[PDB]
From a paper:
A byproduct of castor beans ([name]), ricin toxin consists of two equal sized subunits, ricin toxin A subunit (RTA) and ricin toxin B subunit (RTB), that associate through electrostatic and covalent interactions. RTA catalyzes the hydrolysis of the N-glycosidic bond of a single adenine base within the sarcin–ricin loop (SRL) of the 28S rRNA, a conserved hairpin-like structure that interacts with eukaryotic elongation factors (EFs) 1 and 2, during ribosome translocation. According to the two-step model, RTA first associates with the C terminus of the acidic P-stalk proteins (RPLP1 and RPLP2; “P1” and “P2”) of the 60S ribosome before being guided to the SRL. In this study, we report the identification and characterization of 11 alpaca-derived single-domain antibodies (VHHs) that recognize distinct epitopes on the hydrophobic surface of RTA normally occluded by RTB.
Numbering used by the authors:
A (entry chain A): 5 to 263
B (entry chain B): 2 to 130
The structure:
């Protein structure tokens, strides 16, 4: 009932993954709201239900497929389907609980987890922090398998949570940040797996604040600096929009554009 | 793997220069390419970058409207056209490969490859060759 974007890990290349993320971005935003050369996601307020979600179908070489559902308002994963079973993170209010009844409507075997999909919770359930969870094409292939096998009784919760952490970073965070897409491209290019460095983690943690600072900026300057980290962990402050233009590919809606 | 820069020199204020960054041993087509500059006693800084996707270009505020980056895939070369040069543009200029454009703000990537640099000096009066 929603647009679907397909990707496979089998034989994935820098190009196939790049083309995939581009398609995700193209379905998350209309392109009609662009500020400081950064697209803004749709405003949630009053957003019609047919416009609310997109579907991302992921397959691997073992012929397993899962379909993730992403909320267009924040690019984040809300649940998934494996065969004719569906699983949803705990929703935050009655409107969102109602919204997710419109996902995978041909699935009656539906379950809503008692937990949400935020990193703090998922790291607790996984027993590991993002800094110790490897990302790459291999991790993504394995995450697809683990999500699929939850539906057969074959994945326990820590592995499920780890697999969500992988998918959210490699799909949602890569769509949000061109820099993170680049970090995933490096892993594909060199056929390697590795945990995200501090630059990635701190960007992920800062997406909402960066979206605010950009949309509330005045003369391209932030009202208050945001502290980020370099790849070596060293800390630096950002005061202006321009240097973030290549880094950020999408922003959550915070306010109406200037008159 | 080599990245060779040429085109630097002494130019007058208001003048123009075109730098070249030519690759050997690999293809520039599938990387972002950035220009960076190091001026005396100053932090090394990203100047301009061109993506491997759809030719998207990015510029530091200080050079917007004066510098233009472009890529000639057939020649495995990237160029930096520098117009309306100012004394403040004097620096050693470097090109580097990256996966995506960052203007250097997160530091060097472990697999990024940098050239050895070309000096650009903006002054009306002669200087060291
Ligand atoms: Cl695979
Ligand atoms: Cl939409
Ligand atoms: Cl939102
Ligand atoms: Cl549960
Ligand atoms: Cl939670
Ligand atoms: Cl972490
Ligand atoms: Cl890596
Ligand atoms: Cl890029």
């Amino acid at each position: 009932q929603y647009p679907i974007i397909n990707f496979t890990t089998a034989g994935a290349t820098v190009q196939s993954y790049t083309n995939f993320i581009r398609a995700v971005r193209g379905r998350l935003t209309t392109g009609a709201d662009v500020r400081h050369e950064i697209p803004v996601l749709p405003n949630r307020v009053g957003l019609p239900i047919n416009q609310r979600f997109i579907l991302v179908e992921l397959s691997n070489h073992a012929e397993l497929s899962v379909t993730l559902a992403l909320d267009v308002t924040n690019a984040y994963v809300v649940g998934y389907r494996a065969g004719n079973s569906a699983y949803f993170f705990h929703p935050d209010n009655q409107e969102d609980a109602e919204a997710i009844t419109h996902l995978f409507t041909d699935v009656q075997n539906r379950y809503t987890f008692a937990f949400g999909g935020n990193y703090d919770r998922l790291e607790q359930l996984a027993g590991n922090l993002r800094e110790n969870i490897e990302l790459g094409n291999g991790p993504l292939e394995e995450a697809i398998s683990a999500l699929y096998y939850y539906s057969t009784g074959g994945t326990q919760l820590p592995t499920l949570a780890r697999s969500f952490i992988i998918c959210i970073q490699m799909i949602s965070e890569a769509a949000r940040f061109q820099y993170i897409e680049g970090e995933m491209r490096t892993r594909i290019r060199y056929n390697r797996r590795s945990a995200p460095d501090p630059s990635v983690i701190t960007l992920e943690n800062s997406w909402g604040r960066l979206s605010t600072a950009i949309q509330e900026s005045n003369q391209g300057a932030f009202a208050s600096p945001i502290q980020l980290q370099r790849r070596n962990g060293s800390k630096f402050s950002v005061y202006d929009v321009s240097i973030l233009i290549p880094i950020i590919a999408l922003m959550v809606y915070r306010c109406a554009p200037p008159p | 793997v080599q990245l060779a820069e040429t085109g630097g020199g002494l130019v007058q204020p208001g003048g123009s220069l075109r730098l070249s960054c030519a690759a050997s041993g690999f293809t520039l087509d599938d990387y972002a390419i950035g220009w960076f500059r190091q001026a005396p006693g100053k932090e090394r800084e990203g100047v301009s970058c061109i993506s491997s996707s759809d030719g998207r270009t990015y510029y530091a505020d200080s050079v917007k409207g004066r510098f233009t980056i472009s890529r000639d895939n057939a020649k495995n070369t990237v160029y930096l056209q520098m117009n309306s040069l100012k004394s403040e543009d004097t620096a050693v200029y470097y090109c580097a490969t990256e996966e995506v454009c960052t203007l250097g703000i997160f530091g060097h990537g472990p697999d990024d490859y940098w050239g050895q640099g070309t000096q650009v000096t903006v002054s009306s009066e002669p200087k060291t060759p």
